[PDB]
Amino acid sequence: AEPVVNAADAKGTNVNDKVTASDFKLEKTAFDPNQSGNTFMAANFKVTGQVKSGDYFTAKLPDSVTGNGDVDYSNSNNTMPIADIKSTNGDVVAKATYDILTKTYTFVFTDYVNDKENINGQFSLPLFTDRAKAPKSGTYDANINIADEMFDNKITYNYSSPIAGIDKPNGANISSQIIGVDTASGQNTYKQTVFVNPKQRVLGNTWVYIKGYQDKIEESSGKVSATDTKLRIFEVNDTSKLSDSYYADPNDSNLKEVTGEFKDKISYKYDNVASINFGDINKTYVVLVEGHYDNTGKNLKTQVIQENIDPATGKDYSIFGWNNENVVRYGGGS
Ligand SMILES: [Mg+2]
Ligand SMILES: [Mg+2]
Ligand SMILES: [Mg+2]
Ligand SMILES: [Mg+2]
Ligand SMILES: [Mg+2]
């Protein structure tokens, strides 16, 4: 019924003891995740002695990073296929997979390895922030491990500040980030975080539009509707505790869900756009969007917008918009 386990894979025997990594290098130590910024890690590796088909070795990510970034594999067993290690002749030497939960790569050997000895090679992998564990702009410990060898590192995330808007006390202010996109399962879903009035200004007759396209509706795979979209809305207690990474957890104590108070305040009157009547609001809110994209293949392009006037004077009308873009593209399914 219950047995002890040490890993998340099926195969022969782990051979970290036979694999030594070397010349470990990050393409860079600083980038803006909020601008589709990322890095790659790359290393040489060698097998001392012999291994066989089904033996494997591993690499582990720290809290600061993910192997998958904004690509979601919930609908694929939280498992993200990786490109294979191939030989000059073209033959696959190892099959690669990344467990999202465990932030662990696994490389399994193919029958290639049987009749050979003292394999050497190198590989690179993309690396992205962990929006959840690296929520704020700053410098994190990024010590990566390979074949049981720790390669100490440090990454700096300069997240474009999600606190953006019209520079005036009455100013319209808003922003968003799509931090989650399922491109494998075929369900075509995404997660977008929207920060409303992150200046925590007092704004009247405030309207917010979440568009599933930007300029030209034809140019986006975005599908915003009653049927395609689910919205959750939270008042923010202390806007100071909002993440630069747009990661927001519904169960956060800093959030107070209010989506209920919005029952008849959300409209889909317009094609591919969700209109939200906030009205007079004097604080910051988070909208968690769970959305869908179409099979067109077009980039998922989005745009969030907020407008308002002075609640006391009804003058000083202000409008502010924020754009979002992601690649949903995939190859062949059947
Ligand atoms: Mg080793
Ligand atoms: Mg999909
Ligand atoms: Mg209003
Ligand atoms: Mg509509
Ligand atoms: Mg205004």
Author numbering: 201 to 534
Cite, word for word, the article reporting this structure.
ClfB, an MSCRAMM (Microbial Surface Components Recognizing Adhesive Matrix Molecules) family surface protein, described as a fibrinogen-binding clumping factor, is a key determinant of S. aureus nasal colonization, but the molecular basis for ClfB-ligand recognition remains unknown. In this study, we solved the crystal structures of apo-ClfB and its complexes with fibrinogen α (Fg α) and cytokeratin 10 (CK10) peptides.
The apo-ClfB(197–534) structure was solved at 2.5 Å resolution, consisting of residues Ser197-Ala534. The polypeptide chain of apo-ClfB(197–534) is composed of two distinct domains N2 and N3, as previously described for other MSCRAMMs in S. aureus. The N-terminal N2-domain contains 146 residues (amino acids 213–358) and the N3 domain 170 residues (amino acids 359–528). In the crystal structure, both N2 and N3 have two layers of β-sheets that pack tightly against each other. In contrast, packing between the two domains is much looser, resulting in the formation of a large groove between them where presumably ligands bind. In the crystal structure of apo-ClfB, the N-terminus (Ser197-Ala201) of one ClfB(197–542) molecule binds to the N3 domain of a symmetry-related ClfB molecule, forming a β-sheet together with the strand G mediated by 2 pairs of main-chain hydrogen bonds. These interactions may act together to stabilize the G-strand of the N3 domain, thus maintaining its Dev-IgG fold and mimicking the transition state of ligand binding.
